[PDB]
Design a protein around this ligand. Structure first.
Ligand SMILES: Nc1ncnc2c1ncn2[C@@H]1O[C@H](COP(=O)(O)OP(=O)(O)OP(=O)(O)O)[C@@H](O)[C@H]1O
Ligand SMILES: Nc1ncnc2c1ncn2[C@@H]1O[C@H](COP(=O)(O)OP(=O)(O)OP(=O)(O)O)[C@@H](O)[C@H]1O
Ligand SMILES: Nc1ncnc2c1ncn2[C@@H]1O[C@H](COP(=O)(O)OP(=O)(O)O)[C@@H](O)[C@H]1O
Ligand SMILES: Nc1ncnc2c1ncn2[C@@H]1O[C@H](COP(=O)(O)OP(=O)(O)O)[C@@H](O)[C@H]1O
Ligand SMILES: [Mg+2]
Ligand SMILES: [Mg+2]
Ligand SMILES: [Mg+2]
Ligand SMILES: [Mg+2]
Lengths: 224, 253, 253, 224
């Protein structure tokens, strides 16, 4: 469950004469469990800005971003950083194009870590990580190697597997399949479908027409 | 309730040197990053909150006990058995005339360890943890390189599994590989043992990968604070914008 | 002909501690970065090539004169007027009981400067060059932060416009903004004044932006060398691959 | 003038079991002054690998890469690093998608620096940098500001201007116009045409059909 009400965000560039760069204007949005809403617009419209605000990576200047943390409504625009941290731990999951991990950790451990932080037994986490990596057709030979030593597609697939290791009630996606081929994109679409089936409120940004049509349930115009 | 609570803390050597009106909380299993300009008061603040510099104003509460209202004996007991302190200059946190093994084992013996073989084995294991060869245990820190001294200090201050570790630029003098080893070690300690860390760093990559929150310090004042990713990716203060823009960008092949 | 020529240079405290069989050239207007594992012998090599540690084997030639075949007086004259040395620990390169102004002005007076006002003005200008407020000129380095001490040492060793500067991790303790200021300063000095630099660093970004060539050191041996971009982007040695893979990747928004 | 003869390059990934990753196999190529050769192939064929080898950023395992440094033939595969440094200073220029500069330097100084390093008077360098920035329609308000504070397109245009500040006899291009719009891409194509007219041996990698057709004079198949 997501309820975004009147979120506006201007970027102030103090490094260049403090010019204002409005991006979001009284943006509103609502997402139900098991529903997927895809942001639609041109480059620079503010899709990533809104998606990052939903993840609290950006701080909307005005407005409310209410999420269902367990059985409570939490406003990200005003929640203490500690509440946001726990929300990300359990409630809101994020998948994007770049994998930000500690370098010398193996891919399997990288994928397992978000679920281990939740206290799940190590064996279960390893089994689920292996399942996810196999689904995204990541060779087993790469499981016990650091992601930084792989290609871009393999690293992105490891990032996606890490994103799907925890069954987040709320999921945010930013071009997860952009660099993936047909089979990998289909596997990611299947993962998104399964996550939606279990009751995940999904907000995504997709550029491929086929992927959006397969996955998207509602379209949010980002032009205004 | 916060493990450490800092309210209106101030200590100024002079009008602008040090820190003024600093407030933040810390909980277990959390990492407070402190970044900012060289000479902004980060080391001064770290000393003050680690029971090494009496503030002129404000209060520090540890487990709901005022830090500087306690006896000196209680503060030293905390710093011996409960806390860890990693100094900006590694030798300041080491005994120059004591071997690396002794430097590590002092802390263990302070926690009641009284088996020499077990202490030595733990010291060797922690030397291997920070990628210092175990055959350097009996060498003095003066024969160590700067990064080796840094890692010895870290091992000494982590061996007792403290509840709270203050670190001043712990990655100084470390190569990127051993830096990654250290980051993984600290992250694992934080997540598993619920260790809390206050880390001053100038490497924004380490802050991003390790700190849950950040404080940005300029001229002794916290000019920005919040979630690490938000501070680094959506900075509001001009100085934070300048700092993030000064990061050396890398490329992917 | 190379400004500095190092052939088969070796100095080992013990079998593995130090450096062995190191050879390289350096010319004017060039930067030789040195990267590698903490404890690999980088500081030892920098001391040896900077007339501070007599090698056990090999030769160092400066302007076609063997470095350690010269008199001690000639070596000290070089280190006073011709060379600059930035130590890994900044205080090791500073006079603790001498003000920052005096620390900078010692080098100027060593080059024949004998006007107090001009020396002080140059010291203030160089303090502002490294973003140290000019009102700290009369303060002792003990009252400086670690990064401030580092920058004071750099200013002291660059004020005389030396032909050759050895630096051990000069960016240690520096925030990214002042680090960028320092990188621009050094690059400008190198390009304009034809300054030559041998810089040991663990920040591969600084090496990439500054070093014209690189030496990768592991366990006292140069395992890889060549063009900086080639070494970092097309590493051949396993250790260099591990090092580059350990770099903390950043993202562009 | 460029003469690449039998350049083969395998990447050895010691971080993952030391697996070999052949990319270039006895690649051969020749470029004349005033001629533009564009590498053609699919992603992963080895276009960037060959282009970087021509710039000495990669070290071919076997083969020769001869360039006309002044009136001398220099083999990059065996030249000392100092020779390659001076070659880059005067002979071989490189333009790519990423701007690698010292952070807090203004865009104008960033563009001027390669020509200043050649000893050209500062006023002439500033005039030429202003000309190049105006041609690539970079607003004057951004000239005295650090590139890191700009958008991706502006940063790429500043990078291109820095690349064209020096009239390199040999030019290497890696997707210079990928992130640029129609007008900026046309300006870059015009710059490439002018550089070719003055007698520049250009080797480029282009993905846009229109740009390649406008600029390319010869096609080098990278499939083998
Ligand atoms: N952290 C930031 N600081 C400054 N400007 C920003 C920041 N993030 C975004 N912008 C600018 O705000 C506008 C919004 O860009 P944004 O990335 O949201 O667009 P988008 O095309 O929807 O994204 P994406 O392609 O990632 O889906 C653009 O001008 C972008 O340059
Ligand atoms: N430095 C490197 N280390 C390891 N593998 C590399 C390196 N550079 C390239 N490769 C790999 O070698 C092959 C060549 O890729 P390359 O980038 O040359 O292809 P390309 O599609 O022609 O390039 P571009 O899109 O930049 O024009 C790919 O497998 C790439 O992953
Ligand atoms: N003993 C002292 N006497 C006077 N001033 C000091 C002393 N120690 C530090 N300072 C000053 O206080 C300020 C804060 O120093 P510090 O906290 O070490 O900075 P940083 O955040 O870089 O560690 C600096 O400007 C420094 O010059
Ligand atoms: N005085 C000394 N006595 C014995 N060993 C030393 C001495 N100084 C340095 N070493 C050893 O020599 C090696 C090289 O040290 P150093 O050159 O400082 O490493 P780094 O490259 O990290 O600076 C290290 O392993 C260190 O332990
Ligand atoms: Mg975007
Ligand atoms: Mg400090
Ligand atoms: Mg050293
Ligand atoms: Mg490529």
């Amino acid at each position: 469950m997501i309820n975004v009400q009147n979120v506006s965000k201007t970027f102030i560039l103090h490094q260049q004469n403090g010019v204002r760069l409005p991006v979001l204007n009284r943006a509103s949005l609502t997402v139900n469990a098991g529903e997927c809403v895809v942001l639609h617009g041109h480059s620079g419209s503010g899709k990533s800005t809104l998606l990052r605000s939903l993840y609290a990576n950006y701080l909307p200047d005005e407005g409310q971003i209410q999420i269902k943390h367990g059985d409570e409504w939490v406003d990200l625009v005003t929640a203490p950083a500690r509440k946001v941290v726990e929300i990300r731990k359990t409630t809101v999951g994020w998948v994007s194009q770049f994998l930000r991990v500690i370098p010398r950790i193996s891919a399997l451990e990288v994928v397992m870590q978000p679920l281990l932080d939740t206290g799940v037994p190590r064996e279960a986490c390893a089994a689920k990580a292996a399942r996810l990596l196999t689904r995204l057709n990541v060779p087993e030979r790469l499981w016990h190697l650091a992601p930084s030593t792989f290609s871009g597609g393999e690293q992105q697939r490891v990032n996606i597997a890490r994103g799907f290791i925890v069954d987040y009630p709320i999921l945010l996606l930013d071009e997860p399949t952009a660099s993936l081929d047909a089979k990998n994109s289909a596997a990611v679409v299947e993962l998104i479908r399964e996550a939606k089936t279990r009751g995940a409120a999904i907000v995504g940004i997709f550029h491929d027409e086929a992927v959006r049509n397969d996955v998207a349930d509602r379209l949010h115009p980002m032009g205004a | 309730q916060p493990l450490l609570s800092v309210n209106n803390l101030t200590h100024l050597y002079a009008p602008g040197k040090g820190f003024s009106d600093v407030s933040f909380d810390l909980w277990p299993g959390e990492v407070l990053g402190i970044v900012g300009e060289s000479g902004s008061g980060k080391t001064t603040l770290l000393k003050s909150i680690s029971a090494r510099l009496t503030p002129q104003q404000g209060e520090i509460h540890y487990e709901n006990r005022s830090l500087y209202a306690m006896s000196e004996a209680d503060r030293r007991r905390l710093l011996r058995t409960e806390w860890g302190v990693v100094h900006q200059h590694p030798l300041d946190g080491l005994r120059r005339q004591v071997s690396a093994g002794g430097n590590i084992g002092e802390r263990l013996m302070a926690t009641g360890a009284r088996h020499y073989g077990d202490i030595r084995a733990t010291a060797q294991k922690w030397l291997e943890e920070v990628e210092i060869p175990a055959n350097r245990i009996d060498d003095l820190p003066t024969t160590f390189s700067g990064g080796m001294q840094q890692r010895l200090q870290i091992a000494r201050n982590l061996v007792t599994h403290p509840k709270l570790v203050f670190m001043d630029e712990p990655t100084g003098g470390l190569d990127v590989s051993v830096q990654a080893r250290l980051l993984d070690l600290l992250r694992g300690l934080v997540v598993e043992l619920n260790l809390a860390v206050v880390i001053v760093t100038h490497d924004l990559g380490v802050a991003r990968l390790l700190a849950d929150r950040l404080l940005v310090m300029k001229q002794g004042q916290v000019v920005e604070s919040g979630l690490t990713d938000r501070v680094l990716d959506d900075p509001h203060h001009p100085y934070t914008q300048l700092l993030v823009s000064s990061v050396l960008q890398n490329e992917n092949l």
